[PDB]
Amino acid sequence: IWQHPRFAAKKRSSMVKFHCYTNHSGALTWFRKRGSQQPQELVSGRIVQTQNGSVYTLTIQNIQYEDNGIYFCKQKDSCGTELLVLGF
Amino acid sequence: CSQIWQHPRFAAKKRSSMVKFHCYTNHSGALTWFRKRGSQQPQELVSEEGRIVQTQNGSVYTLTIQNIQYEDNGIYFCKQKCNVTDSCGTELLVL
């Protein structure tokens, strides 16, 4: 599955959006992996998952240090996005 | 808005050796190479005094690290204007 961006760097409190594109439409869902731990499936004013055609968008509001990690989508898989938080 | 193919995904090489990376895209947009090392952040690739060379042939853009130094351990990907697309990139490991 095609996902964008590859990398992403934002300041604590900001927001971001990850996009997963796919014409093969089944059941899509996002995950978050921290380091070498097992990926935990994402669940939704903090985490918003949407869809519009072949486009699926993950949104992360009020970002924060405990959000660094890789975000990828799976569908009945992508290389995902790595998020690095910053601050002020 | 394109989806860039790239090869390889991973590459392990001994210090002072050479590697080529390839990404393909028929989309006309301006393509450029990036490097994300450690916890820094991506950086448009540098001339490297001519150690790192960027060639191209048709739709096949190539990156070539010569005499690989331990300092090149990272992820190398292509960025293309269109939004703007990225490729999954290559993980280079220096042994």
Are A29 and A74 spatial neighbours (Cβ–Cβ below 8 Å)? yes
Q: Which residue, A60, A13, A38, A70, is CA-closest to B36?
A: A70
* Domain layout of chain B by residue ranges: 1-95
A12 contact partners, CB below 8 Å, separation of at least 6: A63, A64, A65, A85, A86, A87, A88
Fold of B1-95: Immunoglobulin-like (2.60.40)
| CB-CB neighbours of B65 under 10 Å | 23
* CATH homologous superfamily, domain A1-88: Immunoglobulins (2.60.40.10)
How far is B39 from B54, CA to CA, in rounded Å?
A: 24
Are B63 and B21 spatial neighbours (Cβ–Cβ below 8 Å)? yes
Q: Which residue, B65, B60, B64, B44, is CA-closest to B6?
A: B60
How far is A61 from A57, CA to CA, in rounded Å?
A: 13
Which residues of chain A make contact with B83, given a CB cutoff of 8 A?
4
Residues 49-88 of A with CB under 8 A from B: 79, 84
Q: A6 in contact with B at a CB cutoff of 8 Å?
A: yes
How far is A28 from A16, CA to CA, in rounded Å?
A: 19
> Closest Cα of chain B to A44: distance in Å?
25
Q: Which residue of B has its CA nearest to A1?
A: B3
